[PDB]
Amino acid sequence: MLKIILPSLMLLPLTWLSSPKKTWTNVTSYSFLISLTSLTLLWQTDENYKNFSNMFSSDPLSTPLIILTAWLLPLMLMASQNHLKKDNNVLQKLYISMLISLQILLIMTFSATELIMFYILFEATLIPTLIIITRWGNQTERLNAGIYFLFYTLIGSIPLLIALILIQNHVGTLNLMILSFTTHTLDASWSNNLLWLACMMAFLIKMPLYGVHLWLPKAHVEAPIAGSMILAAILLKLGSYGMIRISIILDPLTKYMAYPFILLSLWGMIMTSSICLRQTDLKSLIAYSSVSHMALVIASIMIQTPWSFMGATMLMIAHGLTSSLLFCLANSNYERIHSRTMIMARGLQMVFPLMATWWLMASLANLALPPSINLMGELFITMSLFSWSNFTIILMGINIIITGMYSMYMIITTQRGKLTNHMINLQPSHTRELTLMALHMIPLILLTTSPKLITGLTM
Amino acid sequence: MNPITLAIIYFTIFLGPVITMSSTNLMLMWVGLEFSLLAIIPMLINKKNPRSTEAATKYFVTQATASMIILLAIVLNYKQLGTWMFQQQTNGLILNMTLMALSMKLGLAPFHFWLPEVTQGIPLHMGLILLTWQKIAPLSILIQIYPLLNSTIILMLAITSIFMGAWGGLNQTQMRKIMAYSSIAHMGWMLAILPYNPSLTLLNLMIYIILTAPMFMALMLNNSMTINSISLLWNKTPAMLTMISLMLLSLGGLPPLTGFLPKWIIITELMKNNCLIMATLMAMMALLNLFFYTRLIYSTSLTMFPTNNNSKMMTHQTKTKPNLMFSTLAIMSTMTLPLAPQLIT
Amino acid sequence: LRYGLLAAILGDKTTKKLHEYSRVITVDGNICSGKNKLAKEIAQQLGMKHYPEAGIQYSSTTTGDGRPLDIEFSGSCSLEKFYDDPKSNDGNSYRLQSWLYASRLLQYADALEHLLSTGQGVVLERSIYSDFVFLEAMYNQGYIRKQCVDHYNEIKRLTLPEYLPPHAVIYIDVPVPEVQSRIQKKGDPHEMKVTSAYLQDIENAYKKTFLPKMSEMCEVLVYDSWEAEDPTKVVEDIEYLKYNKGPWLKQDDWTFHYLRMLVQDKTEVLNYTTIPVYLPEITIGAHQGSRIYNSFRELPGRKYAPGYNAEVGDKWIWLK
Amino acid sequence: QWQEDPEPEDENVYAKNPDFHGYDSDPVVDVWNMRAVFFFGFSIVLVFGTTFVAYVPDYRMQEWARREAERLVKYREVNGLPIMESNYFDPSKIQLPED
């Protein structure tokens, strides 16, 4: 794991020592090489998990998240290159440093084998996202968005810290593999119910429920493109990863203690898809779509079926890729027009043909299309939920119908129709942003071609 | 001033806590406390403004009353046992009076009302000397009687100091009052961990001191008094901003800054002693502390407040920053979390 | 900062290095009345150091290369534009006045540092004690507003009483028509567009406030033009002056030491001129302020501390 | 009002560099950034990484489990054993609590 962490650590001296005319080139190229290096722990021949160190470990669950983070860092650099062109060199290098530190801390978080170290790196990732959102956001409400994001996360995470220290004082180790082996059943008391709530609510805040979710649209609207990318593609999945990790020591009482959150997830995915239907902001629409998909992930992890876990992992990776792609496309239009109003730019398929192709493919990934890991994850989540109770299929069907409706509504209202001819400042395309869309979409095709990698722990 | 009386006053300021922490007689601890108070008063009232006079008066009467209660406890112990130290079988009333009076010396709630008043209206270096150096001798006496303390009164004082400090720092806009309420909250944490581990309150005291020394140094550099005054720091000293933000986050207790370590290890020890209710309440009010720190960070670092015309002349001139004191303490107070097993003792 | 408590203990006493001509002499008068030449001659034949009137570019001339900077780096005053059109939509009159007050404050601090460090007397032209005359003339002519006046008075209250008044205040009384004739004969096209009411306002402010308020703390040497335009009778008066009042008599070595510290730290001198009172004539805003600050740091000799600039010299960069 | 710079208009980047690739204002850094992104992002990580992942063998013992299942099914069929015995663990080595 150190062979991946240390080059990413040395990215920062490269960033601060590179010439100002070569900084973006050097950091982007070496971060691509670091992702290529991070591809090496897919070499999983045996069923044994790759335990490199006494503190670092690999997993069929942790590996796709690490590879996605290492892949997404150069994509964030490419996306954030254009909107920092009229900026001080020190500020540009500081922004690149924030992105690189996010990548380092997230790789360490996913590869950490101890829950307390996972918590430390969890809040360590909480810091530079706040700095990015507040310092480089565009509108006034970035400060409110940062406050909401930070303190939703912290009020979630403090009972998680209390619960982790309780578990460490009880069993003596707080190591994931020792807990997984000598896990102990809980005697179903009110203290154990509160312990379950304390160790769940941090991750239930971090990936959005129907309740606490109000920080996500604010942060996504007010964040720059790299911040939206890192949030919607890694941090919600970080909450899901934490839930999958910590659910193993709560064996007997999850089967009744998970009831309110399953209902909250299903009805909330319906309501957030409805908001996507009647939403006037493109980034808000993508954010609420992310809430709906993560609600599906919450329901699968709560019902704790092998099909549910596999579908949860597939939906995690697929949703990260397609949400980053949608955010990048919306950011390209926003860099053209300097407004996120959805109804204002309408006939963009006329002037941007292949960007419209990327829009069409991104929306076909957003809805569940059967040659895609999106439909793979959503379909196996549906199968596990219907096994859990047959009446969940009604909520699933309503969610799928509204999902198709808001995705095709997005395509029709922002690409098709008569072109708003008054918008003179529609530059043709940047090879950079077309490359950005291609680097989002081609991994979706490859993971569709071989979905055994995205299958998680259970099979 | 005058170098001779400067030497006398500063040597007595040093000598007070040294006598208190190195003397095994309660009477000599009390005369060390008296040394500290009487020596620090002329340093407080030095600018000879009405606010300095009021702060000196308030500080004098508060510390004199608290020291008189301390001396009452010492004399009652001497009456009961004939010794000059609370050995093991003293009266709980005597011990509770000792704890209450030392709490009023320290300035934690509900005896906290004078501390933002005295810290306001006093120059920044004297506020630093107060909020760091004056809190070692009463803490030394409290550490000396490590058992035989009332955990109920300790936990009540700790929880109300953390609550009132979080609320006060949330309300205040004056930087010195913000630092005073931060002092009240951190003293609440130290007092909370006092009857279970003296090492952890010593560790939290050291972390707090090395965290708020460079905060006061950075305030002292530009003589910044208010939130607006610290907000126009991007034009005055733009290199300060990252260290200011990191130290404010470390005072908030965010990982992976080393200010997370004292709260983390105190919560660990309280889990070991089964005080989950107190630990949870303390952690939530520490989140409130972090909120007013983060509002300060928004004002000074992550946004750029408007500046005025004369800051051009300020940029024309040259400055001077203390070597070996600011940068060393800032680095040791931000990036020393992976040395946590070495820090705990 | 070489000077400090240690240097004062080892012996750097101002009263030890004082002298019978270690005086602060401030020359004052109206817009065009012989005060630049008079101060030059007084310093010349008293052995003082002549400080000309602190203009817009005083900090630019006294810091860095010494060449005047751009009109946006050194304030935004434009005295020519003030003469062309006061009462502008942007606040230029009060910006010019506040910048001139801060420049005069820096000049007074430099003069005090020179006098306390070397013992040589200084002759200033129109120190900080005679800048409120310009501010009150601006206000009474309607060029600025009461908010600007209150902000100026707040800065003056914060900065002025921390220093010492001049030993002698020489004044050159001259009638307003004579000032008008001298201004017209000078020939500056911007300065020709001054109001006789404005000049009379400056003279009235002088006579009504400056002369008594300084007479109660030092001595005043009001002259006419014929008593002036002859810089030898004035020098003889200064030689046979008696310094028997004011706060220069009640102070000693350690008061001088603390004043010398406060006056050699220039950021402490200019600290209260940058109070965050958000007057729209004075406050700037983040984008323009950051553009100006970055461009000023990209000026030569300004990117780092003055000891550390390889583009202009400073060869021993790696050992200091 | 305060002394603020106005909102700047956004320049047509293709007005001065008609071969603009999205990366940098001057053409040389722009074209070299384009080449670096394409080479390091499509050539050596989307092809060599794909080949490496494709030739990872026996990914989580799938082919091994195929061969082992074929061997066990063949053995239990030709030896008449009940293929896939109902109990995993042998009942003789499990001690049940009394009554």
């Binding site: 300097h338 | 205040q172 806009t173 607006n228 | 406050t283 | 700047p8």
Partner: peptide
């Protein structure tokens, strides 16, 4: 568009010693 920075209103909401 241009990044919003605090104006006189946002800068004056932090004065008053009570918040």
């Amino acid at each position: 568009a241009r990044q919003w920075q605090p104006d006189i209103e946002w800068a004056e909401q932090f004065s008053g010693a009570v918040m």
